[PDB]
Design a protein around this ligand. Structure first.
Ligand SMILES: Cc1cc(C(=O)N2CCN(C)CC2)cs1
Ligand SMILES: Cc1cc(C(=O)N2CCN(C)CC2)cs1
Lengths: 237, 300
């Protein structure tokens, strides 16, 4: 059934599961044509497939060529997503295949269920959480590899860097969702928070800066301020 | 014209014969139904006055034998039986006909309703859906479940309708997932029509039989089957033109015959709105769409 606040610790148990987010698969710029009509131009996209217990992020880059000559692209994008997730699962050894796949949008349920009919034991589940994974393209290294791709490509990263050496997967996911929520609510402020201090760097093999434990507590507090703020600047409170 | 005699009527009961209904009081001198049209299947069905629970009845074709009804006080119901002694039967019917002990099948001459509801329904196919091979007639009641319902518990007493499931490997070709799910023509024309049913007459026969069990017995799994078979056609972009035209006629007469007060439980809002307003065949069911909009505009 649907994943929600009541069953949140299930994400960090020892049953392999993946979140799938399709919100950055089909991406466009909207513009005027010489005749003054409106047209779209697609740009590269990505499927965001994440193991919340381990931090493994299977980033499948969606190159614009996949849309050439196709109709009803927003509908095709859900099916292309389901096709690529099914191919990923089939590529994994049996003992690494997920036992559940949680989709962040309900419109992915039927496309994924149909593509996974060969796997009747894998549960396809929606969620009641409003997870901020659309903001993954505000992570500079992820945006960079998506935009530079000249062909379809899968890149493998850990979105927790080395955090699991010092914190649990519950705490790591909480930090991740806070960072992504902040970046989604005010990208510039969030990015200022994360980089203002030039002595804290991002390792070549990492996505986020190398904060000490004490600095993460400050950072995390600053992201909560931002989110409550913007919630005032937004609603005037 | 043929006859189904009754040994007696020991318990008060509403008896229906196809779309007709009448009341028989406890121990009333009732000895059956005469003038039944030859050439059609028929259904004779029952609802006891004391327990409106369980509607039940029997599908039969008088060309296949001499059938009668006899109440059983142990099992507590009116049972259909076959009389093999043809002389014994013709004499019995004649004596009762001579004494005016039977109600006449009241077929108005202009009226093609029953033909139009049973056009493709054959006894031999009924007997494969309702398995009880020692009898030439078939018992159905309100509570019987379908083979597919049992997949989601006595198999001998099941309705073995053809399983239709839009999210199944049978329905979806590897590598055509999106194509086959959004346009079900492959599943309709290759898997079901060419492969299982063999022709559209047999498909329409099962569809009509499922409707009639839903209407006369309130059989829920039959209602599911009727709607599934409609939706499979409406959700196919490529359907033979003669099938669409015939489907429109079939559904028109089903909607025309449905009791107005049962529409809330016998009609699935989602299926009908999809079929009439969103599907590939949204513009191909002119008669059905007109009667639906004038009779059940609330549903839509
Ligand atoms: C399967 C995935 C692994 C990682 C990752 O960060 N590394 C963990 C250490 N080794 C064992 C594999 C590489 C991202 S996706
Ligand atoms: C074969 C038969 C049909 C009917 C019929 O239509 N009536 C049933 C009795 N009254 C109360 C309503 C109307 C009677 S005998």
């Amino acid at each position: 059934g649907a994943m929600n606040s009541s069953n949140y610790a299930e994400l960090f148990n020892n049953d392999i599961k993946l979140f799938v987010d399709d919100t950055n698969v089909y991406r466009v710029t909207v513009h005027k044509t010489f005749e003054g009509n409106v047209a779209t131009k697609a740009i590269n996209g990505c499927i965001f497939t994440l193991n919340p217990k381990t931090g493994h992020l299977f980033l499948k880059i969606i190159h614009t060529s996949v849309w050439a000559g196709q109709k009803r692209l927003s509908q095709l994008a859900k099916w292309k997503t389901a096709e690529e997730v099914s191919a990923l699962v089939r590529s994994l050894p049996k003992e690494e295949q997920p036992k559940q796949i949680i989709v962040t949008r309900k419109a992915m349920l039927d496309p994924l269920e149909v593509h996974m009919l060969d796997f009747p034991n894998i549960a396809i589940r929606p969620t009641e959480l409003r997870l901020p994974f659309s903001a993954a393209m505000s992570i500079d290294k992820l945006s960079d590899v998506v935009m530079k791709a000249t062909e379809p490509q899968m890149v493998l990263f850990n979105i927790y860097d080395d955090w699991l050496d010092r914190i649990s997967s519950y705490t790591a996911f909480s930090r991740l969702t806070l960072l992504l929520r902040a970046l989604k609510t005010n990208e510039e402020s969030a990015k200022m928070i994360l980089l203002s201090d030039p002595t804290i760097t991002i390792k070549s093999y990492h996505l986020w800066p190398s904060f000490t434990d004490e600095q993460w507590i400050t950072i995390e507090s600053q992201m909560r301020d931002l989110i409550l703020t913007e919630y005032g600047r937004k609603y005037n409170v | 014209m043929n006859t189904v005699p009754f040994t007696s009527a020991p318990i008060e009961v509403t008896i229906g014969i196809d779309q007709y209904s009448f009341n028989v009081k406890e121990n009333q001198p009732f000895h059956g139904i005469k003038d039944i049209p030859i050439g059609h299947v028929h259904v004779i069905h029952f609802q006891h006055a004391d327990n409106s629970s369980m509607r039940y009845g029997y599908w039969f074709d008088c060309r296949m034998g001499n059938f009668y009804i006899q109440y059983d006080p142990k099992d507590g119901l009116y049972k259909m039986m076959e009389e093999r002694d043809g002389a014994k039967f013709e004499n019995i019917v004649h004596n009762f006909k001579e004494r005016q002990m039977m109600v006449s099948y009241p077929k108005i001459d202009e009226d093609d309703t029953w033909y139009n509801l049973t056009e493709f329904v054959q006894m031999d196919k009924i007997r494969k859906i309702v398995r009880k091979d020692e009898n030439q007639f078939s018992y159905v009641d309100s509570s019987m479940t379908t083979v597919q319902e049992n997949e989601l518990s006595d198999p001998a007493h099941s309705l073995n309708y053809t399983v239709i499931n839009f999210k199944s490997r049978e329905a979806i070709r590897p590598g055509h997932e999106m194509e086959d799910f959004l346009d079900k023509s492959y599943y309709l024309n290759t898997v079901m029509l060419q492969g299982i049913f063999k022709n559209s007459s047999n498909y329409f026969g099962e569809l009509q039989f499922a409707f009639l069990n839903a209407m006369f017995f309130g059989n829920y799994g039959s209602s599911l089957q009727w709607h599934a078979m409609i939706e499979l056609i409406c959700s196919s972009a490529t359907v033979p033109k003669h099938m669409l035209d015939k489907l429109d006629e079939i559904l028109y007469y089903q909607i025309k015959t449905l009791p107005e007060q049962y529409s809330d439980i016998l009609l699935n809002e989602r299926v009908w709105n999809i079929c009439l307003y969103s599907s590939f065949q949204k513009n191909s069911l002119h008669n059905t769409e007109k009667i639906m909009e004038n009779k059940y505009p609330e549903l839509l």
